[PDB]
Write an enzyme that holds these catalytic residues in place. Structure first.
Site, PDB file in Angstrom:
ATOM      1  N   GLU A 147      -3.553  13.570   0.876  1.00 22.40           N
ATOM      2  CA  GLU A 147      -4.852  13.082   1.346  1.00 22.40           C
ATOM      3  C   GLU A 147      -5.657  14.295   1.846  1.00 22.40           C
ATOM      4  O   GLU A 147      -6.743  14.579   1.369  1.00 22.40           O
ATOM      5  CB  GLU A 147      -4.645  11.997   2.431  1.00 22.40           C
ATOM      6  CG  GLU A 147      -3.977  10.741   1.830  1.00 22.40           C
ATOM      7  CD  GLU A 147      -4.251   9.475   2.612  1.00 22.40           C
ATOM      8  OE1 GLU A 147      -3.975   9.498   3.887  1.00 22.40           O
ATOM      9  OE2 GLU A 147      -4.732   8.489   1.980  1.00 22.40           O
TER      10      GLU A 147
ATOM     11  N   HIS B 290       2.963  10.946   6.891  1.00 17.54           N
ATOM     12  CA  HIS B 290       2.234  10.640   8.124  1.00 17.54           C
ATOM     13  C   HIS B 290       3.148   9.991   9.166  1.00 17.54           C
ATOM     14  O   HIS B 290       3.661   8.879   8.937  1.00 17.54           O
ATOM     15  CB  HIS B 290       1.042   9.686   7.858  1.00 17.54           C
ATOM     16  CG  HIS B 290      -0.005  10.372   7.052  1.00 17.54           C
ATOM     17  ND1 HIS B 290      -0.980   9.643   6.318  1.00 17.54           N
ATOM     18  CD2 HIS B 290      -0.278  11.739   6.921  1.00 17.54           C
ATOM     19  CE1 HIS B 290      -1.795  10.494   5.728  1.00 17.54           C
ATOM     20  NE2 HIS B 290      -1.428  11.789   6.098  1.00 17.54           N
TER      21      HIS B 290
ATOM     22  N   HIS C 194       1.859   9.124   1.264  1.00 10.35           N
ATOM     23  CA  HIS C 194       0.896   8.939   0.165  1.00 10.35           C
ATOM     24  C   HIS C 194       1.321   9.894  -0.937  1.00 10.35           C
ATOM     25  O   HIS C 194       1.755  11.023  -0.688  1.00 10.35           O
ATOM     26  CB  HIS C 194      -0.546   9.321   0.592  1.00 10.35           C
ATOM     27  CG  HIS C 194      -0.962   8.521   1.811  1.00 10.35           C
ATOM     28  ND1 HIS C 194      -1.689   7.311   1.821  1.00 10.35           N
ATOM     29  CD2 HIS C 194      -0.671   8.755   3.139  1.00 10.35           C
ATOM     30  CE1 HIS C 194      -1.817   6.879   3.078  1.00 10.35           C
ATOM     31  NE2 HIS C 194      -1.252   7.719   3.917  1.00 10.35           N
TER      32      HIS C 194
ATOM     33  N   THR D  96      -6.738   6.728   7.523  1.00 10.89           N
ATOM     34  CA  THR D  96      -7.154   6.886   6.111  1.00 10.89           C
ATOM     35  C   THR D  96      -7.074   5.636   5.249  1.00 10.89           C
ATOM     36  O   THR D  96      -7.436   5.676   4.070  1.00 10.89           O
ATOM     37  CB  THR D  96      -6.334   8.003   5.441  1.00 10.89           C
ATOM     38  OG1 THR D  96      -5.005   7.493   5.242  1.00 10.89           O
ATOM     39  CG2 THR D  96      -6.381   9.332   6.206  1.00 10.89           C
ATOM     40  N   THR D  97      -6.698   4.510   5.884  1.00  6.63           N
ATOM     41  CA  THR D  97      -6.671   3.206   5.220  1.00  6.63           C
ATOM     42  C   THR D  97      -7.607   2.275   6.009  1.00  6.63           C
ATOM     43  O   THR D  97      -7.734   2.441   7.264  1.00  6.63           O
ATOM     44  CB  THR D  97      -5.279   2.560   5.214  1.00  6.63           C
ATOM     45  OG1 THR D  97      -4.820   2.349   6.569  1.00  6.63           O
ATOM     46  CG2 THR D  97      -4.307   3.439   4.484  1.00  6.63           C
TER      47      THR D  97
ATOM     48  N   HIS E  52       5.045   6.865   7.024  1.00 11.52           N
ATOM     49  CA  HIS E  52       4.879   6.458   5.627  1.00 11.52           C
ATOM     50  C   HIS E  52       4.399   7.690   4.871  1.00 11.52           C
ATOM     51  O   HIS E  52       4.067   8.716   5.497  1.00 11.52           O
ATOM     52  CB  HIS E  52       3.871   5.257   5.531  1.00 11.52           C
ATOM     53  CG  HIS E  52       2.521   5.679   6.048  1.00 11.52           C
ATOM     54  ND1 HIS E  52       2.167   5.586   7.403  1.00 11.52           N
ATOM     55  CD2 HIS E  52       1.493   6.309   5.417  1.00 11.52           C
ATOM     56  CE1 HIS E  52       0.963   6.121   7.586  1.00 11.52           C
ATOM     57  NE2 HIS E  52       0.533   6.585   6.330  1.00 11.52           N
TER      58      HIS E  52
ATOM     59  N   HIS F  83       0.849  -1.210   0.000  1.00 12.77           N
ATOM     60  CA  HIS F  83       0.000   0.000   0.000  1.00 12.77           C
ATOM     61  C   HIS F  83       0.877   1.251   0.000  1.00 12.77           C
ATOM     62  O   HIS F  83       0.561   2.199  -0.729  1.00 12.77           O
ATOM     63  CB  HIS F  83      -0.972   0.018   1.199  1.00 12.77           C
ATOM     64  CG  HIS F  83      -1.842  -1.183   1.229  1.00 12.77           C
ATOM     65  ND1 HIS F  83      -2.845  -1.417   0.231  1.00 12.77           N
ATOM     66  CD2 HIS F  83      -1.904  -2.215   2.086  1.00 12.77           C
ATOM     67  CE1 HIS F  83      -3.493  -2.555   0.528  1.00 12.77           C
ATOM     68  NE2 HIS F  83      -2.938  -3.065   1.674  1.00 12.77           N
TER      69      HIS F  83
HETATM   70  N1  LIG Z   1      -2.755   6.746   6.787  1.00 11.55           N
HETATM   71  S1  LIG Z   1      -2.837   6.901   8.412  1.00 11.55           S
HETATM   72  O1  LIG Z   1      -4.228   7.221   8.823  1.00 11.55           O
HETATM   73  O2  LIG Z   1      -1.726   7.785   8.938  1.00 11.55           O
HETATM   74  C1  LIG Z   1      -2.437   5.279   9.039  1.00 11.55           C
HETATM   75  C2  LIG Z   1      -2.014   4.289   8.187  1.00 11.55           C
HETATM   76  C3  LIG Z   1      -1.644   2.989   8.637  1.00 11.55           C
HETATM   77  C4  LIG Z   1      -1.107   2.014   7.693  1.00 11.55           C
HETATM   78  O3  LIG Z   1       0.122   1.712   7.714  1.00 11.55           O
HETATM   79  N2  LIG Z   1      -1.955   1.632   6.746  1.00 11.55           N
HETATM   80  C5  LIG Z   1      -1.525   0.672   5.638  1.00 11.55           C
HETATM   81  C6  LIG Z   1      -2.500  -0.487   5.512  1.00 11.55           C
HETATM   82  O4  LIG Z   1      -2.625  -1.216   6.682  1.00 11.55           O
HETATM   83  C7  LIG Z   1      -1.575   2.818  10.038  1.00 11.55           C
HETATM   84  S2  LIG Z   1      -1.060   1.211  10.763  1.00 11.55           S
HETATM   85  C8  LIG Z   1      -2.271   0.021  10.119  1.00 11.55           C
HETATM   86  C9  LIG Z   1      -3.701   0.453  10.519  1.00 11.55           C
HETATM   87  C10 LIG Z   1      -4.227  -0.279  11.744  1.00 11.55           C
HETATM   88  C11 LIG Z   1      -3.798  -1.803  11.803  1.00 11.55           C
HETATM   89  C12 LIG Z   1      -2.244  -1.848  11.762  1.00 11.55           C
HETATM   90  C13 LIG Z   1      -1.814  -1.423  10.381  1.00 11.55           C
HETATM   91  C14 LIG Z   1      -2.002   3.776  10.938  1.00 11.55           C
HETATM   92  C15 LIG Z   1      -2.377   5.047  10.427  1.00 11.55           C
HETATM   93 CL1  LIG Z   1      -2.798   6.251  11.603  1.00 11.55          CL
HETATM   94 ZN   LIG Z   2      -1.189   7.659   5.960  1.00 12.99          ZN
END
Ligand SMILES: NS(=O)(=O)c1cc(C(=O)NCCO)c(SC2CCCCC2)cc1Cl
Ligand SMILES: [Zn+2]
Length: 258
Positions: A104, A117, A94, A196-197, A92, A62
């Site tokens: 985003e 992020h 986007h 956001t995922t 990471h 992703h």
């Molecule tokens: N885009 S974001 O809102 O900053 C965010 C992204 C992820 C993340 O790494 N998502 C990729 C698919 O799992 C994660 S960790 C992910 C989500 C919860 C289960 C563990 C993997 C946490 C956040 Cl805050």
């Molecule tokens: Zn993110």
């Protein structure tokens, strides 16, 4: 099959597996800068990354994650809108297929080329998996990227990407200092939102910095060479891995400045 960003499994499909996609505090959102109200009760943010211990970089299909040792209080976010202490676990990005899209969050409908992020979890809940089950479990520092002058502090990340081209590849990534990805000002907007995922959990206090960082065209071109697919499968460039802005609903976005 599984969720992604492609023709057939992208953001407009996620609600079928994750009905909270249509919830009351989803992210990202457009930040209407004229409507966001200055909040004199917010504090300066405290970003304490001096003892940050990076461990590894992972292509998860992703995006890519730069992972940290969060088994002790080392790199922590606090102050601003937050109560208590949040520990950095990963960052990471986007980004887009072209420089006119990729973020985003948007600012008065403006799309940036990419968005970083930095993900943190509230230490009152003991671990990340317990934190994501709570409305105040995570804090994400969001930083916009525009294309212009190179960001020296990003180059170590850029140069390791050819070693993690495809989904499920990882590389040792020690001694990376995330302070080199910050802009000069810590002026920010904040609001209550979500991941956001998938699984789109409504557990995030968003802190989005106003000042973008600049990265060079050559740096972002290396992001766009990564792949969503695994080794030996048909090539799907990892581009456009952003969720569009969602309805603000019954929320206020607060400004730390003006
Ligand atoms: N885009 S974001 O809102 O900053 C965010 C992204 C992820 C993340 O790494 N998502 C990729 C698919 O799992 C994660 S960790 C992910 C989500 C919860 C289960 C563990 C993997 C946490 C956040 Cl805050
Ligand atoms: Zn993110």
């Amino acid at each position: 099959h599984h969720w992604g960003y492609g023709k057939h499994n992208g953001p407009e499909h996620w609600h079928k597996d994750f009905p909270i996609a249509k919830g009351e505090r989803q992210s990202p959102v457009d930040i209407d800068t004229h409507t966001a109200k200055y909040d004199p009760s917010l504090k300066p943010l405290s970003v304490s990354y001096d003892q940050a211990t990076s461990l590894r970089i992972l292509n998860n299909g992703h995006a890519f994650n730069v992972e940290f040792d969060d088994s002790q209080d080392k790199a922590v976010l606090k102050g601003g809108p937050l109560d208590g202490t949040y520990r950095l676990i990963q960052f990471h990005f986007h980004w887009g297929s072209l420089d006119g899209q990729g973020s985003e969050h948007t600012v008065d409908k403006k799309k940036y080329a990419a968005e970083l992020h930095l993900v943190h979890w509230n230490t009152k809940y003991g671990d990340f998996g317990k934190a994501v089950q709570q409305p105040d479990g995570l804090a994400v520092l969001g930083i916009f990227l525009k294309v212009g002058s190179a960001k020296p502090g990003l180059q170590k990340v850029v140069d390791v990407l050819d070693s993690i081209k495809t989904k499920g590849k990882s590389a040792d990534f020690t001694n990376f200092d995330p302070r080199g990805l910050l802009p000069e000002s810590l002026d920010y907007w904040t609001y209550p939102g979500s991941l956001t995922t998938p699984p789109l959990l409504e557990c995030v206090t968003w802190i989005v910095l106003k000042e973008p960082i600049s990265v060079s065209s050559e740096q972002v071109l290396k992001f766009r060479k990564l792949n969503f697919n695994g080794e030996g499968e048909p090539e799907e460039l990892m581009v456009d891995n952003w969720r569009p802005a969602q309805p603000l609903k019954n929320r206020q976005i607060k400004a730390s400045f003006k």
